[PDB]
């Protein structure tokens, strides 16, 4: 129901503000890995 | 009271047994000195 | 040591000491084994528990007859 | 010269992700009448 | 009372006229006697782990060591790294004077609190 | 070179938490008992089971809140989510109290994780396993009252319940029913218990007590080195200190710590022993000459007869909210009650 | 020296002198078997197996000679109340006779061995140090456990030739050594049927045996040798008490539960069974059954088996007893003589009551009367001056129907109490407490000493097989660790793998 | 020594460390939060709301008393407040 | 007979404290 | 026959098939990739 | 036939004596009141 | 007589205790935190009765 | 039969005491 998505949505775009600030510097570290 | 008659050979024994073996341990260690 | 008749005879059973197959051998065989025989006390666990219930099969003293 | 995304990085999440949203949860539940 | 079973019935009349179980200090003691009976353990148990070999199987290890000998007899570095492993390093200790301060004072100040 | 030797080393990586193959067992079970009892006490009830609030969510605080056992009418069900009695229904199975053996069960295993642990990092690093051997105590503790328990017993339902109130009810329950402080092998478990407090606290201060100068602050922990050969105090002036005090002092310092492993584990291991007869209602609850005596003679009063009193108020008082499955009704007229309370 | 608790490593490394020890210890064991059974034979009265069953008088042996088949004494008695019988060699006083000629030939060949230590034998030809082939002595020794396992089962059990094993009906009345046939279906694993039992012994047997052949020819992997130290004694130890205490936890648990192989008649009830009324529920089935073709109700009650009667009552709960309340059952309510009839209250309307029984948990327990609807109508107050419900003011009756108070009633109120105080232990039972000098506190069956000697066993080798597997595994460093360990080694992050010293960085 | 991982004492005083979490942190508090203000704790969970406890004059529990059929008595006991 | 036996027991610890005190393997050095 | 605990107990079965080798399935991938190197 | 080159000896120091004496004797000391019953 | 109602609770071995059942008890509610020396006693049975043993130890 | 309970303590410890004492005096005789 309704309630689900009210729940989930803080965490959608708190994962998606984390992963916008962070992905950059998370290429660096997957090429290092041969 | 009325206790059980055989608590007294009980409590001899499992005072005895277990302190003899140990006095007989004790003695001839200190006689190989 | 001492040799007797007996020893004659079972000595090849105690000949072998140390030898080994090589490498990882019969172990993944062993492993299938394994496995099948904890499926299997599962259910045996779970049906004495009535967690698993089969069909015909009573788990109560009433099963005796 | 780090890895941002490492074992120790998850295991801190595993824990401190679900702690904050308990966290508010229960913040909520003070403010529940009867 | 000055007696096992008398001991017993004040703890028992103690909980029905104070709720003491539900009373902080006293699961503060709880706290402080639970967690001496593990540390306790735990530093017997690591020392005991990291033990210099000096005897053979035959003999008590307790013989490796002589009354006022001037270097220990476990190694710490050793205990440290097996500790350290297995919760992570600095949940571990590596001064000595330290971890037995620590295991003084843990059961020494919840006993306090449950006086 | 093949890839179990590739996943062992991959494992057995010096990182900031070591994994091991024993993290694969560990790592997952401990993770989930601790969600289950955090999950359980804020938002689970257990109005069903027990007739009880018991979460966050229903107005407890953290010394009411408890993941409680099932109800009697479930027996030892493992209480599978997917089993016959949720039938796969997450929130039945929440009522139904299928939270507890989802803790105790990845407890023990967890257990298991957690001690294959001490032996794997010992194994790696070099030193000798006692640590482990240690940790048999918790865990014989764990398994006697949380499974052996209730596994003598009509259900899970008498087991503890995962809470700080509930496990003080558990406490009492054990006084009133089975007069567990009577108990040789719970008496041997308080002294271990005790003698492994007190232990910890006179050997901390000794060795702070009798510390060498080995620097010239007053703050006397930088003085020491971890890699430094010497000892840091005087095991002899302890020997005096201790022998002129008491009578008797320790000598030998692998002696002094092996008995600190063996004072508490074996106190645990006792009274470990005392709940598996309690699991068959196998109490030392009486001693017959005094019942004799007592019965014949109405003057004779002990502090042994004083403390059955106790736990027949404590059965008859509690026992209908405790049991509520045996709609246990008693009449005022049948509690037992002294003068004016 | 050695330290006390280390005295028996001397045989680590002697074949022929651990033989000699293994050889002792089943001297001693079966020894005790045929001193216990004798014992047991010499105060075990066989004359009522009604109502002074084995069970009742701490035979403990017995019921594993009975279960088995071995039912009868050379006194002409069998266990069954069958008389005149001859039971041939195989009595009880044969079987423990066999026992301890068999203790005591052990005890000659432990002599020889311990003397005749140095047989060639137990000495590797390569090396000349002595040394034992675990993994093939593992095989030979599984293949003959399937081989007995197998004529166990397809002999012994099924009668083919053999006695079979005590069978029994649900309710424990008619209970006899019968041949069992094998059940090979999925109730096989039902533990409540016995012919899964057989089953399990023919096919397990046959993989044993199967499983044996495979370790007699095939060599441990090289990884699963090194990993395990196949090459020391130890580790059978360590491993072969985990399999142990496998063992006793499984078999306390069906001694505690009941299963086919643990009948009530040898052993007495389960706890469960008082629980959920199993037996009551039974003899209520019957008296309705008497009712509905019309018997009176001193008929239908009268039709009762006594020995039916006698397991609906708390007093051989195996959950009753106590920790040091020691001895049979019969020196606590004594012996059992008669069921002195099933026991009916009602209050002065006519209306029937019900005594509401003691739970397992409750060393005492309040005399509450209920209507057929839980309503509580009667019970004996504590506190008089409020009194609403006394046995008095009721106008509380009881009434006989069945055994030795047939037909009987009651009305003064000291004596309904008495009886009705009698009546929360179930049904109501003359005993003889003279005899015994029984001092009227319940002690548990031998069900329950066996659980809790087995599960308080379990728990202990547990320790064991920690012990003596951590003992295994760190061999090398059971005396101390290495002197010359190096910091860099138990620091972090020298090596990148934990104690490989290969991953240096 | 150390093991290769960033310093927590160096990652909590940096600053993107504190631009991400200033967002995640409170985002996860409101995701709680609303999980309670919107009642659906209530329902995942079945634990009942303060005016559902009891029936209106009643005042039994609803106490599960078989096993097998015990998903359908918390069910029947449920459309006794409906 | 049951107190004699208890009494008993008590006095031989207090007899054991004695030796163990003035009686013991006396602690060396090196 | 094929009862609702018998089906149950396959769905647990599986259940914890996937779990176990799916773990294992991302363990041995991340210990091919991330090697060490001696 | 050689002499067996197993045999070892055994030993108690008095330290040890004096421990379990006291634990058998407080065993003891605990144990018969639940013996005598 | 510990609680002070004249109902004495029997505390040592010669009357019928056991080491776990025994104890000294506890001086009278009836001289409740009275100072109570043997030279207070009108004799030592009295002494004995009202607890005294108790509060010397 | 009406035996004599003190009997068994009797005959046990008659048989105890001085058969331990003979075997503390041989085994310290053989160690030395
Ligand atoms: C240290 C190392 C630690 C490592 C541990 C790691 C965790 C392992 C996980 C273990 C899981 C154990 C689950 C046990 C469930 C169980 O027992 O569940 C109980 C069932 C039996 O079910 C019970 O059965 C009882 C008896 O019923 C019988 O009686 C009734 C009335 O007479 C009816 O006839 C009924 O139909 C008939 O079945 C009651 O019915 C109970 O309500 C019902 O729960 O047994 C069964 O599952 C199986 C029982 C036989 C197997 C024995 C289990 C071994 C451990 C047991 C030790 C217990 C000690 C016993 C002493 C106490
Ligand atoms: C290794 C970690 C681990 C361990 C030891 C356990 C252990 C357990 N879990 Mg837990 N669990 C885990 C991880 C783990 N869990 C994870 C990661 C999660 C998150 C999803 C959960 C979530 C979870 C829930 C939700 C529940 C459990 C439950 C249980 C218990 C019952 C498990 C059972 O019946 O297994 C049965 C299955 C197995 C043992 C797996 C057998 C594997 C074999 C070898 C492979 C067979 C192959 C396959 C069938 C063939 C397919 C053929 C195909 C062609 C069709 C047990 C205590 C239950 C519980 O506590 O009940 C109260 C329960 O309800 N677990
Ligand atoms: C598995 C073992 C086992 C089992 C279950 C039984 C069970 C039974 N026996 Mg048998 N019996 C056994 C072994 C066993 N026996 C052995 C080995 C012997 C020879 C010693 C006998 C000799 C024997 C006789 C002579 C009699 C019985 C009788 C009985 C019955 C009564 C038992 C009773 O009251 O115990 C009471 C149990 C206790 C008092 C518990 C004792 C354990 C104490 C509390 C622990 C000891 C202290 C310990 C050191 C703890 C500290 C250690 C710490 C430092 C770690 C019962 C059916 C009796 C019967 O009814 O006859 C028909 C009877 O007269 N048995
Ligand atoms: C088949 C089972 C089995 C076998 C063959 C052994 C064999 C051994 N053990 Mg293990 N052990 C076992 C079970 C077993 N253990 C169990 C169940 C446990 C947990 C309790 C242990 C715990 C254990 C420890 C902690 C230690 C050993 C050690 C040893 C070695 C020396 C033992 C010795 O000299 O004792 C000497 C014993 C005595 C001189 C007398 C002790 C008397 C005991 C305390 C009580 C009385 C026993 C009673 C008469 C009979 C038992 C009856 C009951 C079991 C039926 C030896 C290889 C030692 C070792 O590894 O050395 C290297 C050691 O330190 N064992
Ligand atoms: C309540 C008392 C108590 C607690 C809480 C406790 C806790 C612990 N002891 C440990 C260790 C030890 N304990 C030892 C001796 C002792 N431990 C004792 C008493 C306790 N010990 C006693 C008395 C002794 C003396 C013998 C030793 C010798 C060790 C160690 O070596 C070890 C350690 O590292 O010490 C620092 C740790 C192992 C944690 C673990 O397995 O992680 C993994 C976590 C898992 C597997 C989850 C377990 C789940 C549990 C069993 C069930 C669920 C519990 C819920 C989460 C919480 C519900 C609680 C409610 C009742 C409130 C942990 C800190
Ligand atoms: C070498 C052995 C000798 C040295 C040991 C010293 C003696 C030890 C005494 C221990 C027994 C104490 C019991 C005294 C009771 C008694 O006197 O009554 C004597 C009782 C028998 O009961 C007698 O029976 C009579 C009619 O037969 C009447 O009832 C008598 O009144 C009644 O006393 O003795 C026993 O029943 C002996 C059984 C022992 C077997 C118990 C096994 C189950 C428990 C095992 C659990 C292991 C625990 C592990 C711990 C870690
Ligand atoms: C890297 C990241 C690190 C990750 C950490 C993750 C580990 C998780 C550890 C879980 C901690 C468990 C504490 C839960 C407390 C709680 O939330 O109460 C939350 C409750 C909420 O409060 C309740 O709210 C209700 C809502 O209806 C009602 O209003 C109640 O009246 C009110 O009491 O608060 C308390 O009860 C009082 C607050 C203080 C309680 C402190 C207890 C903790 C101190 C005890 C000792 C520590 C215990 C842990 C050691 C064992
Ligand atoms: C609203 C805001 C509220 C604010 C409240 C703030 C709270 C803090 C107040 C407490 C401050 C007390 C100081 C603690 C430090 C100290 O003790 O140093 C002593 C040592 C020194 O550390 C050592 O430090 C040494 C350097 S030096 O001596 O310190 O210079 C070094 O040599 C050594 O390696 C290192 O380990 O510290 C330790 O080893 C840890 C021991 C922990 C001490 C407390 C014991 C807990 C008892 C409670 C148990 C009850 C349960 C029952
Ligand atoms: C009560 C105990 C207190 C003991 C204090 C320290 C003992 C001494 C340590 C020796 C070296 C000295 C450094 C002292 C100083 C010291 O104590 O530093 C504390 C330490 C500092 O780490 P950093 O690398 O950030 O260090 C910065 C410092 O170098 C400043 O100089 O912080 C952490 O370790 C945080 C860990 C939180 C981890 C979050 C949870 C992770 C989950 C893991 C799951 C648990 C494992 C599961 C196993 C089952
Ligand atoms: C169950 C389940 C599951 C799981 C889940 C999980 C895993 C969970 C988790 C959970 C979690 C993970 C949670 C957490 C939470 C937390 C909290 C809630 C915390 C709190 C705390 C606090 C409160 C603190 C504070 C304080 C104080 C008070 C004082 C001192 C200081 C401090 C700061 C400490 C699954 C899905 C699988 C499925 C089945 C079911
Ligand atoms: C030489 C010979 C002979 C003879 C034989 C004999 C006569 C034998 C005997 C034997 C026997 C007669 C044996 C028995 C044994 C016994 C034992 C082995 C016992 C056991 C014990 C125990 C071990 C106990 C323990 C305990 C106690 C005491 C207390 C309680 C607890 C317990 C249980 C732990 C003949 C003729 C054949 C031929 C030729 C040769
Ligand atoms: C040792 C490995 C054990 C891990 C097993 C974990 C199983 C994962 C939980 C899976 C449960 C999902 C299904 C629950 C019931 C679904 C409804 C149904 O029965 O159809
Ligand atoms: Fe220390």
Redesign the interface.
């Given at each position: 129901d309704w309630r689900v998505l009210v729940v989930l949505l803080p965490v959608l775009l708190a994962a998606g503000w984390a992963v916008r600030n962070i992905l950059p510097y998370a290429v660096k570290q997957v090429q290092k890995l041969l | 009271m009325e206790v059980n008659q055989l608590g007294l050979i009980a409590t001899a024994l499992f005072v005895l047994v277990p302190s003899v073996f140990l006095i007989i341990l004790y003695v001839q260690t200190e006689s190989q000195q | 040591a001492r040799r007797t008749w007996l020893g004659d005879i079972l000595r090849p059973l105690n000949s072998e000491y140390g030898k080994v197959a090589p490498g990882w051998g019969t172990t993944p065989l062993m492993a299938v084994f394994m496995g099948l025989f904890l499926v299997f006390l599962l259910i045996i666990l779970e049906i004495y528990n009535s967690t698993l219930i089969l069909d015909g099969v009573n788990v109560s003293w009433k099963a005796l007859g | 010269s780090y890895p941002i995304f490492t074992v120790r990085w998850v295991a801190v999440h595993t824990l401190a992700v679900p702690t904050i949203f308990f966290l508010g949860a229960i913040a909520a539940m003070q403010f529940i009448q009867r | 009372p000055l007696g096992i079973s008398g001991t017993f019935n004040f703890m028992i009349v103690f909980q029905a006229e104070h709720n003491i179980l539900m009373h902080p200090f006293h699961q503060l003691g709880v706290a402080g006697v639970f967690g001496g009976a593990l540390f306790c353990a735990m530093h017997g148990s690591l020392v005991t782990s990291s033990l210099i070999r000096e005897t053979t199987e035959t003999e008590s290890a307790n013989y490796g060591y002589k009354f006022g000998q001037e270097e220990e007899t476990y190694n710490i570095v050793a205990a440290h790294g097996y500790f350290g492993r297995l919760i992570f390093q600095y949940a571990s200790f590596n001064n000595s004077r330290s971890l037995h301060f620590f295991l003084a004072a843990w059961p020494v100040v919840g006993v306090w609190f449950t006086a | 070179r093949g890839?179990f030797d590739?996943?062992d080393?991959?494992?057995?990586?010096?990182?900031?938490?070591?994994?091991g193959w024993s993290g694969?067992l560990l790592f997952p079970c401990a993770?989930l008992a601790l969600?289950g009892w955090?999950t359980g006490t804020?938002?689970?009830?257990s109005?069903?089971?027990?007739?009880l609030a018991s979460?966050?969510?229903?107005?407890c605080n953290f010394?009411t809140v408890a993941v409680s056992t099932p109800?009697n009418?479930?027996?030892?069900?493992?209480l599978?989510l997917?089993?016959?009695?949720?039938?796969?229904?997450?929130?039945?199975w929440?009522?139904?109290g299928g939270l507890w053996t989802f803790i105790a069960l990845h407890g023990a295993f967890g257990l298991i994780g957690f001690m294959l642990?001490?032996?794997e990092?010992?194994?790696?690093?070099?030193?000798?396993?006692?640590?482990?051997?240690?940790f048999?105590?918790p865990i014989?503790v764990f398994?006697?009252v949380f499974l052996?328990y209730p596994?003598?017993q009509?259900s899970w339902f008498f087991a503890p319940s995962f809470g700080?109130?509930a496990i003080?009810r558990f406490?009492?329950f054990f006084?009133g029913?089975h007069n567990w402080?009577?108990?040789?092998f719970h008496?041997?478990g308080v002294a271990?218990?005790?003698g492994?407090?007190?232990?910890?606290?006179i050997?901390?201060?000794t060795?702070?007590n009798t510390?060498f100068q080995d620097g010239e602050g007053a703050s006397?922990?930088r003085?020491?080195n971890?890699?430094?050969?010497?000892?840091?105090y005087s095991?002899?002036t302890a020997?005096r200190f201790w022998?002129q005090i008491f009578?008797?002092?320790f000598?030998?310092?692998?002696?002094?710590?092996?008995?600190?492993?063996?004072?508490?584990?074996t106190?645990?291991?006792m009274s470990?022993?005392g709940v598996?007869?309690l699991?068959?209602?196998?109490?030392?609850?009486?001693?017959?000459?005094?019942?004799?005596?007592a019965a014949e003679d109405p003057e004779?009063?002990?502090?042994?007869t004083?403390?059955l009193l106790?736990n027949?108020g404590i059965?008859?008082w509690m026992?209908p909210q405790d049991q509520?499955?045996?709609?246990f009704?008693?009449?005022?007229?049948?509690?037992?009650?002294g003068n004016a309370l | 020296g050695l330290p006390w608790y280390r005295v028996h490593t001397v045989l680590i490394n002697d074949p022929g002198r651990l033989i000699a020890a293994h050889l002792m210890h089943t001297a001693l064991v079966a020894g005790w078997a045929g001193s216990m059974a004798l014992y047991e034979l010499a105060t075990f009265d066989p004359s009522d197996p009604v109502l002074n069953p084995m069970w009742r008088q701490g035979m403990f042996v017995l019921p594993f000679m009975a279960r088995l088949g071995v039912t009868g004494s050379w006194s002409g008695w069998s266990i069954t109340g069958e008389t005149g019988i001859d039971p041939g060699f195989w009595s009880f006083e044969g079987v423990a006779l066999a026992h301890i000629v068999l203790s005591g030939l052990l005890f000659l060949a432990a002599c020889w061995h311990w003397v005749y230590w140095d047989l060639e034998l137990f000495r590797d030809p390569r090396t000349g140090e002595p040394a034992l082939d675990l993994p093939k002595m593992f095989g030979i020794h599984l293949f003959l456990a399937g081989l007995l396992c197998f004529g166990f089962g397809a002999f012994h059990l099924t009668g083919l030739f053999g006695p079979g094993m005590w069978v029994s009906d649900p309710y424990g009345l008619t209970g006899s050594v019968q041949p069992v046939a094998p059940e090979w279906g999925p109730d096989g694993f039902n533990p409540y049927n016995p012919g899964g039992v057989v089953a399990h012994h023919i096919a397990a047997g046959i993989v044993g045996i199967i499983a044996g052949l495979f370790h007699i020819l095939v060599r441990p992997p090289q990884r699963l040798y090194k990993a395990l130290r196949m090459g020391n004694i130890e580790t059978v130890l360590s491993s072969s008490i985990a399999a142990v205490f496998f063992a006793a936890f499984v078999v306390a648990g069906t001694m505690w539960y009941g299963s086919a192989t643990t009948p009530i008649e040898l052993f007495g009830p389960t706890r469960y069974q008082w629980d959920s009324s199993y037996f009551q529920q039974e003899i209520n089935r019957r008296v309705q059954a008497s009712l509905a073709s019309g018997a009176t109700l001193e008929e239908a009650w009268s039709a009762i088996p006594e020995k039916l009667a006698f397991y609906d009552y708390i007093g051989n709960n195996p959950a009753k007893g106590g920790l040091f309340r020691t001895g049979p059952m019969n020196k606590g309510d004594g012996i059992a003589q008669a069921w002195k009839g099933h026991a009916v209250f009602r209050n002065k309307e006519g209306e029937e009551l019900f005594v509401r029984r003691m739970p397992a948990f409750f060393e005492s327990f309040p005399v509450i009367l209920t209507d057929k609807n839980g309503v509580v109508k009667a019970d004996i107050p504590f506190r008089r001056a409020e009194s609403k419900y006394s046995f008095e003011q009721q106008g509380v009756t009881v009434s006989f129907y069945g055994g030795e108070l047939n037909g009987q009633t009651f009305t003064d109120p000291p004596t309904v109490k008495s009886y009705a105080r009698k009546a929360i232990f179930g049904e109501i039972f003359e005993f003889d407490t003279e005899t015994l000098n029984s001092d009227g506190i319940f002690r548990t069956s031998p069900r329950g000493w066996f659980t809790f000697a087995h599960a308080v066993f379990a728990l202990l080798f547990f320790f064991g097989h920690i012990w003596h597997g951590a003992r295994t595994l760190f061999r090398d460093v059971f005396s101390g660790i290495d002197p010359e360990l190096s910091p860099e080694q138990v620091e972090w992050g020298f090596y990148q793998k934990v104690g490989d010293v290969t991953t240096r960085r | 020594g150390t093991t290769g991982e960033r310093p927590f004492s160096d990652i909590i005083t940096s600053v993107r460390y504190w631009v991400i979490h200033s967002i995640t942190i409170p985002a996860l508090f409101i995701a709680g939060w609303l999980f309670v203000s919107t009642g659906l704790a209530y329902d995942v969970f079945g634990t009942p709301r303060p005016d559902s406890y009891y029936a209106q004059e009643q005042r039994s529990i609803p106490l599960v008393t078989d096993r097998f059929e015990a998903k359908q008595q918390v069910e029947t006991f449920l459309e006794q407040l409906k | 007979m049951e107190t004699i036996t208890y009494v008993f027991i008590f006095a031989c610890i207090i007899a054991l404290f004695f030796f163990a005190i003035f009686f013991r393997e006396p602690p060396r050095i090196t | 026959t094929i009862t609702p605990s018998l089906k149950g107990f396959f769905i647990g079965l599986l259940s914890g098939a996937v779990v176990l080798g799916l773990t294992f399935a991302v363990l041995i991938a991340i210990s091919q990739i991330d090697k060490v190197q001696r | 036939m050689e002499p067996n080159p197993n045999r070892q000896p055994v030993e108690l120091n008095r330290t040890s004596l004096y421990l379990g004496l006291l634990l058998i004797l407080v065993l003891a000391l605990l144990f018969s009141s639940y013996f005598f019953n | 007589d510990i609680d002070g109602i004249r109902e004495p609770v029997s505390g040592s071995l010669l009357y019928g205790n056991n080491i776990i059942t025994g104890a000294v008890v506890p001086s009278s509610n009836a001289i409740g935190l009275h100072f109570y020396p043997i030279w207070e006693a009108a004799s030592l049975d009295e002494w004995l009765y009202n607890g005294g043993p108790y509060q010397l130890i």
């Open positions: - | - | - | - | - | 890839w590739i996943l080393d991959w494992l057995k990586r010096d990182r900031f938490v070591f994994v694969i993770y969600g955090l804020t938002f689970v009830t109005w069903y089971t027990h007739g979460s966050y969510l229903e107005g010394l109800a009418s479930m027996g030892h069900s493992l599978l997917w089993g016959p009695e949720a039938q796969g229904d997450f929130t039945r929440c009522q139904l642990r001490q032996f990092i010992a194994r790696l690093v070099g030193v000798r396993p006692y640590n482990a051997i240690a048999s105590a014989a398994v006697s052996i596994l003598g009509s700080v109130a003080f406490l009492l006084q029913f402080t009577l108990n040789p008496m041997m271990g218990v005790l492994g407090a007190l232990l910890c606290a050997h901390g201060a060795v702070e510390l006397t922990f003085a020491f971890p890699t430094q050969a010497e000892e840091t095991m002899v020997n022998s009578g008797i002092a000598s030998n310092k692998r002696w002094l710590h092996f008995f600190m492993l063996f004072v508490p584990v106190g645990l291991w470990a022993i598996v007869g699991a068959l209602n196998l109490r030392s609850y009486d001693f017959i000459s005094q019942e004799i005596r004779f009063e002990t502090f042994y004083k403390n106790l027949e059965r008859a026992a509520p499955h045996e709609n009704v008693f009449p005022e007229e049948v509690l037992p009650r | - | - | - | - | - | -």
